[PDB]
Amino acid sequence: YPADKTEEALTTFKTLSQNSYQNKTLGNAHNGRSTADGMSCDCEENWDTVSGINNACGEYSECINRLTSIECISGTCSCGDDCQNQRFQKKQYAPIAVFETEKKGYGVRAQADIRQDAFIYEYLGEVIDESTFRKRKENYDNQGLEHFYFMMLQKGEFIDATAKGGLGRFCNHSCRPNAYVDKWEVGNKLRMGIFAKREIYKGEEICFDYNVDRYGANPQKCYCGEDNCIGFLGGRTQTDSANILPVPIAEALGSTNAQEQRWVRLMKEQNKSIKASDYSSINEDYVNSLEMRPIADKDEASKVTSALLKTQDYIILRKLIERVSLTKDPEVLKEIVRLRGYQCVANILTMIVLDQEQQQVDVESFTLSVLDMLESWPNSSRNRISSSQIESVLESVKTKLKKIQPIGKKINSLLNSWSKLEISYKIPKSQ
DNA sequence: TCTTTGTGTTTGGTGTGTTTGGGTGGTGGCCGTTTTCGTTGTTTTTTTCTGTCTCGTGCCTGGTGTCTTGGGTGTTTTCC
Ligand SMILES: Nc1ncnc2c1ncn2[C@@H]1O[C@H](CSCC[C@H](N)C(=O)O)[C@@H](O)[C@H]1O
Ligand SMILES: [Zn+2]
Ligand SMILES: [Zn+2]
Ligand SMILES: [Zn+2]
């Protein structure tokens, strides 16, 4: 496996055993209202005489304070000293190591198998106010740092892990994380712990959801590798009307922040229903009402290819194919060929005219609207097609819809045109 | 295929209804003392109005999980 980088990671910052405070007023529980009647659990101390360990307030015990995310304090609770609900104070962190893989920096891995709901590691840092946070953020942006190191302890109170903190700062974002951050009360103070969402084995990376507020900062692309990745690091939108479809997909359709604003502003503010921000359900009316302009940028072509590889909706694919019909720039088409647009168009065909979630007349209109640019694009070799074998799909769909003779004749012309093109070499291999 | 429930009529009976005698409790008479009605005065407290800080209340957005519905079966209770 990857080489250990634990000491090298430790040397990059001032290691802390506990959270540091800018002042004694910050970080106090109940907004500084000292609960003199501290919540004392009614647990009886359970001392195992063999090991001398106080087993009270354990994981499978019925300690009320543990359920309510409050730690027992020695000398005040009936559970006695050294109970099993002093995890933050005793600093009983899980054993972890630091390593590096993929496009990520340093990352945290489990040195041992960790149970579900087990406390992993206490996020450490300096407790700071809002103005100090703004000053440090401006300084780091001037320094060009490309890493988040701020977490919101609570309203108006943040934790900075840049110069001083703990191993938890090296945990990387995952869109399907195995751990999560939670807020707990220890004495008259507030702590942020990290707990295991599931069973984690040795060697596996430990990750948590950042749910990051950008505060107007630019998006950063997410390289977590999870299948459910949204592609960028963020959280909830700063207001409604901000997105209706995912960016790459929205920009593939020619839509931008203004066009996504305009639809919601025209209907939602005038007593017509638009659901919350969720891309699992496509709103066909927005896609139909969207305006379409020809593509002349290769990054937009890459976004179109990503939308083809991602979106399953019939209407979004219809409007993307219509936009491609408007598009006539040869360089963008050559880029789409390099991106293997034929491969995506094969699946787009298959989902609509082999799988039947729609009506035959509308599918016929779709097929006539998608054969045209296939007929129009520049082609110079069958090796372009060989990366997709879309001809096979064309044969299957002309055979299925044999009653619709215009589609069959167009596919005849298309395969006749493609049959005459040249071929390119593949090195023979020993046998 | 196959068990219950009602009102009605002849005859019995036991408990409701009626009738005399008396004794005890309700009815008539007058006298005294005080409980309460009436008035008058004080003054406590209850209402009604004005101004600021405060903290909670109202509303809106996102969503986790608790509430509701369909299927099987078996074991628990029902019937003779
Ligand atoms: N899944 C991911 N893909 C890309 N960058 C990631 C990531 N998870 C974390 N990061 C990067 O790491 C930052 C958090 S700090 C994590 C430790 C740091 N990468 C280091 O090795 O020193 C994020 O702001 C981001 O820049
Ligand atoms: Zn306890
Ligand atoms: Zn305890
Ligand atoms: Zn991701």
Side-chain angles (χ1 to χ4, degrees), chain A residues 2-431:
Chain A
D4 199 338
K5 306 294 184 179
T6 294
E7 300 295 342
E8 191 177 350
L10 284 159
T11 53
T12 66
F13 71 103
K14 177 171 175 179
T15 304
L16 295 179
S17 62
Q18 65 196 35
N19 274 315
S20 60
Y21 312 93
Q22 177 170 341
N23 57 76
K24 295 180 182 297
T25 54
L26 293 173
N28 296 318
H30 305 275
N31 313 335
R33 296 186 173 183
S34 63
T35 53
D37 289 345
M39 301 187 183
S40 170
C41 65
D42 305 333
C43 313
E44 306 182 10
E45 60 191 353
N46 180 18
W47 290 85
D48 183 19
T49 58
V50 174
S51 59
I53 294 164
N54 189 17
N55 311 341
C57 319
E59 186 176 355
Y60 304 110
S61 63
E62 299 191 356
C63 183
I64 295 163
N65 302 13
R66 199 194 190 91
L67 299 175
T68 57
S69 302
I70 302 167
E71 271 206 341
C72 305
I73 302 299
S74 293
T76 70
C77 300
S78 66
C79 62
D81 309 340
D82 301 333
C83 82
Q84 298 290 352
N85 195 15
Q86 311 192 348
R87 293 181 286 179
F88 285 77
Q89 293 171 115
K90 294 187 176 182
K91 300 170 186 177
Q92 297 170 342
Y93 310 138
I96 50 170
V98 186
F99 76 110
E100 182 167 49
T101 51
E102 210 66 18
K103 187 160 168 61
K104 296 173 291 192
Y106 294 148
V108 182
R109 52 179 176 181
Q111 281 174 324
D113 305 337
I114 293 158
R115 296 184 179 182
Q116 186 187 6
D117 304 329
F119 173 57
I120 314 186
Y121 190 82
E122 183 181 3
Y123 191 93
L124 296 175
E126 311 187 13
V127 186
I128 51 172
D129 76 85
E130 186 172 355
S131 56
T132 301
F133 147 77
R134 291 177 183 282
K135 292 176 180 180
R136 289 197 171 191
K137 177 179 173 300
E138 290 174 13
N139 298 330
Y140 300 155
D141 296 330
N142 297 328
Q143 292 153 25
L145 311 188
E146 301 187 356
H147 294 335
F148 304 139
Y149 283 110
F150 289 86
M151 190 183 293
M152 177 177 290
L153 172 53
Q154 56 177 330
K155 187 176 182 180
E157 311 187 3
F158 304 88
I159 294 163
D160 184 16
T162 309
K164 318 188 181 178
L167 300 175
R169 67 206 289 271
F170 296 106
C171 302
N172 293 280
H173 173 58
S174 171
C175 301
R176 187 173 294 184
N178 57 0
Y180 67 99
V181 171
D182 195 352
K183 180 168 66 175
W184 276 59
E185 192 182 7
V186 175
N188 68 327
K189 297 288 188 175
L190 305 183
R191 311 295 196 76
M192 309 303 287
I194 298 159
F195 294 77
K197 180 62 173 171
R198 57 169 187 78
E199 193 70 39
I200 293 164
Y201 301 90
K202 177 170 181 179
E204 301 180 349
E205 197 188 13
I206 294 160
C207 300
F208 71 100
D209 182 15
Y210 282 12
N211 179 16
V212 59
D213 188 349
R214 298 186 188 132
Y215 285 88
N218 306 331
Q220 184 171 8
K221 179 163 175 183
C222 187
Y223 306 86
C224 65
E226 301 282 17
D227 59 348
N228 70 329
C229 179
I230 57 173
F232 297 100
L233 318 162
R236 194 193 296 187
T237 61
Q238 302 292 348
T239 296
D240 202 353
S241 76
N243 282 125
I244 306 155
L245 291 168
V247 175
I249 291 158
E251 291 163 4
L253 292 157
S255 187
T256 55
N257 288 0
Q259 292 192 2
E260 293 168 86
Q261 268 157 7
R262 189 173 183 77
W263 189 69
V264 184
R265 287 205 179 281
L266 284 160
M267 280 200 291
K268 217 195 183 205
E269 292 164 42
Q270 306 190 41
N271 304 349
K272 276 176 180 174
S273 53
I274 291 91
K275 293 179 179 179
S277 62
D278 189 353
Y279 319 122
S280 62
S281 62
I282 292 91
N283 200 326
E284 296 181 18
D285 294 330
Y286 172 56
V287 185
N288 276 358
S289 55
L290 266 178
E291 299 194 348
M292 299 299 166
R293 40 164 173 103
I295 308 160
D297 185 296
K298 292 198 174 205
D299 204 15
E300 296 185 31
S302 180
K303 295 162 180 189
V304 165
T305 302
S306 187
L308 303 196
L309 291 177
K310 286 170 173 288
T311 307
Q312 298 172 339
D313 172 44
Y314 173 52
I315 297 302
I316 286 181
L317 294 168
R318 281 181 81 164
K319 288 313 191 196
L320 289 173
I321 287 157
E322 179 166 18
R323 200 190 177 206
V324 169
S325 81
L326 309 178
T327 297
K328 294 182 181 177
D329 174 29
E331 269 287 6
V332 161
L333 301 177
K334 284 195 184 191
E335 186 56 42
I336 290 163
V337 166
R338 293 182 183 174
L339 298 153
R340 307 178 300 283
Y342 295 112
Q343 184 172 42
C344 314
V345 168
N347 170 43
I348 291 160
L349 285 168
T350 300
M351 187 179 290
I352 300 307
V353 62
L354 292 183
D355 185 17
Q356 276 193 248
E357 296 200 333
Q358 305 293 345
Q359 306 81 11
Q360 287 196 135
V361 176
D362 196 16
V363 168
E364 168 184 8
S365 75
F366 172 79
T367 310
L368 295 182
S369 183
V370 74
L371 282 182
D372 297 331
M373 67 290 297
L374 296 175
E375 185 178 2
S376 78
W377 294 342
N379 289 280
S380 307
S381 172
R382 290 193 73 245
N383 283 57
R384 300 183 174 199
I385 296 142
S386 184
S387 77
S388 67
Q389 304 197 0
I390 183 169
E391 305 188 354
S392 50
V393 183
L394 294 175
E395 294 268 50
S396 306
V397 304
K398 68 180 286 187
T399 308
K400 161 159 171 160
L401 298 195
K402 208 166 185 178
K403 177 176 177 66
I404 300 97
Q405 280 298 336
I407 295 172
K409 198 176 181 184
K410 287 184 67 61
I411 290 174
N412 286 348
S413 165
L414 193 56
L415 298 183
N416 179 63
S417 183
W418 290 350
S419 72
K420 296 185 180 184
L421 305 174
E422 296 295 346
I423 61 172
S424 298
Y425 178 77
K426 179 63 172 282
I427 301 170
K429 295 180 57 166
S430 187
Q431 309 186 4

